[PDB]
Amino acid sequence: HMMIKSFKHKGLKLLFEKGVTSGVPAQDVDRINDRLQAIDTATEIGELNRQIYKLHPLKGDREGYWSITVRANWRITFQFINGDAYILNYED
Amino acid sequence: SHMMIKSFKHKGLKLLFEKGVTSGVPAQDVDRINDRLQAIDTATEIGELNRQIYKLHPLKGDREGYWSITVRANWRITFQFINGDAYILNYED
Amino acid sequence: MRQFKVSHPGEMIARDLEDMGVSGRRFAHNIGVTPATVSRLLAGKTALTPSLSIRIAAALGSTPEFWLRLQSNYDLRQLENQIDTSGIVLYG
Amino acid sequence: MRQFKVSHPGEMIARDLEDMGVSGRRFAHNIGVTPATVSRLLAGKTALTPSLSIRIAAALGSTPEFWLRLQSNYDLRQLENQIDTSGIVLYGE
């Protein structure tokens, strides 16, 4: 499959699955949806390495997780394995 | 870099795949084998190889864990398939 | 479940350019294609082609394969239920 | 290493039809496209499009994604010597 498999963030889940926007900032709806489309489409992590995304692996206790920037301090974080993305969260 | 053919047991297949050299496989099957290697290389999951003409099936003996697709008659390509990657490509039987 | 709204990659690129402060014209010059071609891409009126995917990756990052996968997945989502395959024989 | 010879999926399909005893004309009638369209596909003269991929998968098996991936990898390999991106600026540096 190689797709998004699970969401930690309920807002992301609602947007992704039903197009319901109440769980994310209104002005970020398309920006977040585009990034979700990217994460869902990528088959390997390198495909997410766009400058605007500021792709980097997290360290310490969240070793194994990755982060992409949505806007400013806000980011989407996830585990990425075999093209599958797990525990999508929207944070910071 | 990911989800491709990673290794060869059969040297003829390796030469064909990597250099297009035909000397290590039967001449009548060159294109047929090259197509099938292209399919195995392109597939990202095993179901994508499940074309009736391929007669896709998992092996069961000591070769459990391996897969088989038919080239022609009794000839087959065998391999391990994980992660979209194909390992130990062989041409046999 | 699959994503509710899947965008044409040209539209996604339009948003990214906007966020980056890059005009369509400036983008067109950089990747070496005509401004008309870019404008049509950005409005989702024309397909992200393989040669476009190579130029776009050089400018926006990621890989040509990724950009093409966005286009092909989008195209397949649009064609869903619009092609009746019920009368087609599966050989074998 | 990557595959040395990557074929246009039309060309692959042509060999498959032949191995199957299926004429291109017969194939065209079954999948619901004009024989002219198929003829061009089989000679590698025209692209395997998304709607063609849905029809082909219905007949030859596998998924529409697989067929499109064969085409996109083919197309990219073909362009390898025809696009200079060295003067293009990567935004974010």
Swiss-Prot record, chain A:
Tagged with keyword Transferase: no
GO BP annotations listed: negative regulation of cell growth; negative regulation of cell population proliferation; negative regulation of translation; plasmid maintenance; RNA catabolic process
InterPro entries cross-referenced by the UniProt entry: HigB-1, RelE/ParE_toxin_dom_sf
Top-rank taxon: Bacteria
Keywords: Endonuclease, Hydrolase, Nuclease, Plasmid, RNA-binding, Toxin-antitoxin system
Site, Interaction with HigA: residue positions: F16, N33
Pfam families referenced in this protein's UniProt entry, alphabetically: HigB-like_toxin (PF05015)
Entry EC number(s): 3.1.-.-
Molecular function as annotated in GO: mRNA binding; ribosome binding; RNA endonuclease activity; translation repressor activity
Top-level class of the enzyme under EC nomenclature: hydrolase
SUPFAM superfamilies for this protein: RelE-like (SSF143011)
Record bears the keyword Nuclease: yes
Leader peptide range in chain numbering: none
Oligomer and partners: Forms a complex with the antitoxin HigA which inhibits the mRNA interferase activity. The heterodimer dimerizes to form a HigB-(HigA)2-HigB tetramer that is able to bind to the DNA.
PANTHER family: TOXIN HIGB-1 (PTHR40266:SF2)
Role, per record: Toxic component of a type II toxin-antitoxin (TA) system. A ribosome-associated translation-dependent mRNA interferase. Inhibits translation by sequence-specific cleavage of mRNA. Prefers either in-frame or out-of-frame 5'-AAA-3' codons (lysine). Also cleaves the first three AAAs of stretches of four or more A sequences. 20% of codons containing AA are cleaved and occassionally cuts even at a single A.
Descriptive protein name: Endoribonuclease HigB
Organism: Proteus vulgaris
UniProtKB/Swiss-Prot annotation, chain C:
Location of the DNA-binding region in this protein: 24-43
Keywords assigned by UniProt, alphabetized: DNA-binding, Plasmid, Toxin-antitoxin system, Transcription, Transcription regulation
Ranges where the HTH cro/C1-type domain occurs: 13-67
InterPro entries on file: Cro/C1-type_HTH, Lambda_DNA-bd_dom_sf, Toxin_antidote_HigA
Stated role: Antitoxin component of a type II toxin-antitoxin (TA) system that counteracts the effect of the HigB toxin. Binds to its own promoter and regulates transcription of the higB/higA operon.
PANTHER family given in the database record: ANTITOXIN HIGA-1
Protein name per Swiss-Prot or TrEMBL: Antitoxin HigA
Organism encoding this protein: Proteus vulgaris
Gene name linked to the record: higA
